[PDB]
Structure formats: structure tokens, C-alpha cells
């Protein structure tokens, strides 16, 4: 469903707010290694 590979398509194209991102699936792995570090493919800050 919410693949972590999708980073430039979830909200970087259209200005809107949606849930189901980051910790939607495999929350343990994200907490272990993807704690705000894999966002934007480890770079390309969205803010």
C-alpha cells in the first residue's frame, strides 16, 4: 500500500495533507532505522 519508496509523489506534487505515511507499515523498522532519516531519500528536505 504505502511503499516507503514513494517520497516525491505522496505530497511533493500537490499541496495537500494525507495520512497513511511513514509508520503505516513496518513501524518497528522505521523506528529502528528510518526515524526521520530516510525522508527525501536521506536528503532533499521537504520543508
TrEMBL record:
Location in the cell: Cell membrane
Name of the protein in question: Transient receptor potential cation channel, subfamily V, member 2
Residues of the full protein shown: 75 to 121 of 761
